[PDB]
UniProtKB/Swiss-Prot annotation, chains A, B:
Homodimer. Within each dimer, one monomer is responsible for RNA recognition and catalysis, while the other monomer binds to the replacement base PreQ1. Residues 244-250, 268-272 are annotated as: RNA binding. Its EC number is 2.4.2.29. It is an enzyme of class 2 (transferase). The active site is at D92, D263. This is Queuine tRNA-ribosyltransferase. GO terms for biological process: queuosine biosynthetic process; tRNA wobble guanine modification; tRNA-guanine transglycosylation. The lineage of its organism: Bacteria, Pseudomonadati, Pseudomonadota, Alphaproteobacteria, Sphingomonadales. Its cofactor is Zn(2+). It comes from Zymomonas mobilis subsp. mobilis (strain ATCC 31821 / ZM4 / CP4). Zn(2+) binds at C301, C303, C306, H332. Pathway: tRNA modification; tRNA-queuosine biosynthesis.
């Protein structure tokens, strides 16, 4: 396999399906990436993550630099060996934490409170030390809402940081030869700024392009409105990654608008909170109505949890605070997401994705 | 397979090795039973529990009657179906909670504070509703220390309760035909009382005999002293079960004294707390000295955890409070216990158990 090759096998409207080939494996698109923030996808062995259908998982520069440390992970042989996942890993750059989990910001980078520093150069270096396959440029996720002036200033800094990220990545031969680098579009909800950002990123040139600055409280209508004009600005022949999205309905609509890659903590995090995804919409397994329900979480789901255990049992586990409850909920939810992505890929391949989206929504929101 | 058949294949001194055949499976003895208090062995799928080598697991009447409820479990098809473990299950009777997790005690039984009641009849009924394979008599675990007078009074009540347990079990045809009933010897640390208890239990007649009233703070020397005279009082041709024991060294010494069955929360509970068992003694994986240790938890252990992950990774997981840390620690510890039991069984079968015990101790306590 090559360092990086994205091939589009089929299209329907703005939707695409295909593959990213990388050294550590093939990624089927549209793709959902389970989030593995602390060098683990919560409550799952890597083999279980793979069994659900995942081709790639997400790590974070910010969290790993704090614990257990980037240099430490490198000394131990890199993130893949450390956690036991041998397939591709995408790492976020820390740019979301620049306004999240305080800080001192400047043109040079960001200092976080022990004191830690991130900059385009340090972020790219950390991602190298982790041995990330898809490296994200170091950016700033503009807060929402933002005024046009502030959104512009923020976006402009991010584009300068994108160029610095590109140069840092390229100067490190082992990284440049074995990993890929994605740029991140900013510009808040403003079409002109999104266009300027896209132009700057395409001029620099990246292996893939993320739509940043969304899933920050704007709501689905606004997010879709921004995607409507933003995705066509990105190079057509490279993957489009919508950061932090999202709920199943968000994913379907984003694919309709040309997005190829997704990640979110929702299936893992909300799973441990009792929320299970089903084709008839989400349920909260903690609800008393499930206490004697012998049916599986979802009637059609092919996952191992739905083959073996009842709603009643999982209800008991989650209510009791049992670790097995988190394990089963998470495996089901991630498997559900992967089944959704598979149905999306198949329907685009067969030229019936529009019908699938309609059918999905009718049942999910019944 | 029969309802119950215990066969002794080989002996060395007081130690025995053999099998218990029951309808749901064969139990190799000496046996370690992982504890599954809330209808789950903590942090493990039943398939993983089986993969470690476990033939049987333990549930508790007290905990399950409170949550999710005994009648509820029966309505849902019984404990085996509920939790997805199809092999034998032994259930404790609630007698330890009679002084543990307040209460109002009388000759009739015990009322626990919502208000719940246990008696020999109700305990046996609950165990029936759960569908337990090995039912424990309802007893009272005498507190330690106890005066001879109080130990005698307590033991005498337990023997009356043992007869009531026998009659309740026998009056329920489906239970009598498909499950087994074990009596529990009491008498604190007093030889004459232990003898009276053994005589009473043998007169009633049970499928197996537990040594109760130990692992209650007495310490290993005293526990071994009591076992020295107590185990030979029990019928030789039936299994001997030491309730609540214990650490690896406790198990080895108890087998040397004629015990066939063990359970304890130690490998599961202490696993989540960071303690890992090794042939060179226990370690606490939280310790900073393990932060960059690439070796597995134990150098010889055949478990899946030791095949795949480093001390360094597990150290990180436990320090970070990650669920996968609990999963990996628990799987290793239970697998370690099962490997210990296998080495015990093989060594007795080969007439070299005395040498094994000596070799085990020399290395474990080096
Ligand atoms: N680096 C980076 N990560 C992101 C992660 C994100 N996660 C969400 N929502 C959950 N929005 C994001 C937006 C960005 C962004 O703009 N930049
Ligand atoms: N029913 C019953 N369960 C027991 C469970 C026990 N667990 C421990 N230690 C941990 N000692 C026990 C002792 C008894 C006992 O005497 N009776
Ligand atoms: Zn499922
Ligand atoms: Zn191991």
């Amino acid at each position: 396999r090559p360092r990086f090759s994205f091939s589009i096998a089929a299209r329907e409207g703005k939707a695409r399906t295909g593959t990213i080939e990388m050294k550590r494996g093939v990624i089927r698109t549209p793709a959902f990436m389970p989030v593995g923030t602390a060098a683990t996808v919560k409550a799952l062995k890597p083999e279980t993550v793979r069994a659900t259908g995942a081709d790639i998982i997400l790590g974070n520069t910010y969290h790993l630099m704090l614990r257990p440390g980037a240099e430490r992970i490198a000394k131990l042989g890199g993130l893949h060996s450390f956690m036991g996942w041998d397939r591709p890993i995408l790492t976020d750059s820390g740019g979301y934490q620049v306004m999240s989990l305080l800080t001192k910001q400047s043109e040079e980078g960001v200092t976080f409170k022990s004191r830690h520093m991130l900059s385009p150069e340090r972020s790219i270096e950390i991602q190298h030390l982790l041995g990330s396959d898809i490296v994200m440029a170091f950016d700033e996720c503009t807060p929402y809402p933002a005024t046009p002036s502030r959104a512009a200033s923020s976006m402009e800094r991010s584009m300068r940081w994108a160029k610095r990220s590109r140069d840092a990545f390229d100067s490190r031969k082992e990284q440049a030869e074995n990993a890929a680098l994605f740029g991140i579009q900013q510009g808040s909800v403003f079409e002109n700024l999104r266009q300027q950002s896209a132009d700057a990123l395409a001029e620099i040139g990246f292996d893939g392009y993320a739509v940043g600055g969304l899933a920050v409280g704007e709501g689905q209508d606004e997010m879709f409105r921004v995607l409507d004009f933003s995705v066509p600005m990105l190079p057509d022949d490279k993957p489009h990654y919508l950061m932090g999205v999202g709920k199943p309905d968000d994913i379907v609509g984003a694919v309709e608008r040309g997005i190829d890659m997704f990640d979110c903590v929702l299936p893992t995090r909300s799973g441990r909170n009792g929320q299970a995804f089903t084709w008839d919409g989400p349920i909260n397994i903690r609800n008393a109505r499930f206490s004697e329900d012998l049916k599986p979480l979802d009637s059609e789901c092919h996952c191992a949890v739905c083959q073996k255990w009842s709603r009643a049992y999982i209800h008991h586990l989650i209510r009791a605070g049992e670790i097995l409850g988190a394990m089963l909920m998470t495996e089901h939810n991630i498997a559900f997401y992967q089944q959704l992505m598979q149905k999306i890929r198949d329907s685009i391949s067969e030229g019936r994705f529009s019908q699938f989206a309609q059918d999905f929504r009718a049942r999910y929101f019944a």
